[PDB]
Amino acid sequence: AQYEDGKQYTTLEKPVAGAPQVLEFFSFFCPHCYQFEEVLHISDNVKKKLPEGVKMTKYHVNFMGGDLGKDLTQAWAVAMALGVEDKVTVPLFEGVQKTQTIRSASDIRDVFINAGIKGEEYDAAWNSFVVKSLVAQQEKAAADVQLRGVPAMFVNGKYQLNPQGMDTSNMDVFVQQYADTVKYLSEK
DSSP states (O other): OOSOBTTTEEEOSSOOTTOOSEEEEEOTTOHHHHIIIIISOHHHHHHTTSOTTOOEEEEEOSSSSHHHHHHHHHHHHHHHHHTOHHHHHHHHHIIIIISOOOOSHHHHHHHHHHTTOOHHHHHHHHHOHHHHHHHHHHHHHHHHTTOOSSSEEEETTTEEEOGGGSOOSSHHHHHHHHHHHHHHHHTO
């Protein structure tokens, strides 16, 4: 076939019921994730090809960067609760991997302040039980699929994108193949 299990995707031998339609995992410490977000714009190109009526979810993970990795997961929960993902994703990636000016939760906080979220609003969110459950959701989703590496994308709790099985000669072509694969899987 043109799309083959174990080639452009793998199947979860242990499917996850009730999972988000399209579920992406990343870490601000993850070098391919940086590529995916700032160079390849994967999330965005997937969305452009997804059918009507299909939601995209993106979660941060704990297993990179130790203590700061966990702060970043809580910060991402804040970003999601406040709906400010599109304002912090780039400065967080660059603060961690490019300029390396993020070394503590306070530095993470500075990124939101600079993006124009108010101190009082950020601190209130950071400490809220709505953010606590949002952290729990991120962890539970990763746990459900026994997640050990990022970037990762899962469709309908049953299929897992396998980007190693795609050409990377051309970055544009890789992205569309990736996006088309997600669409194929979504229609399965």
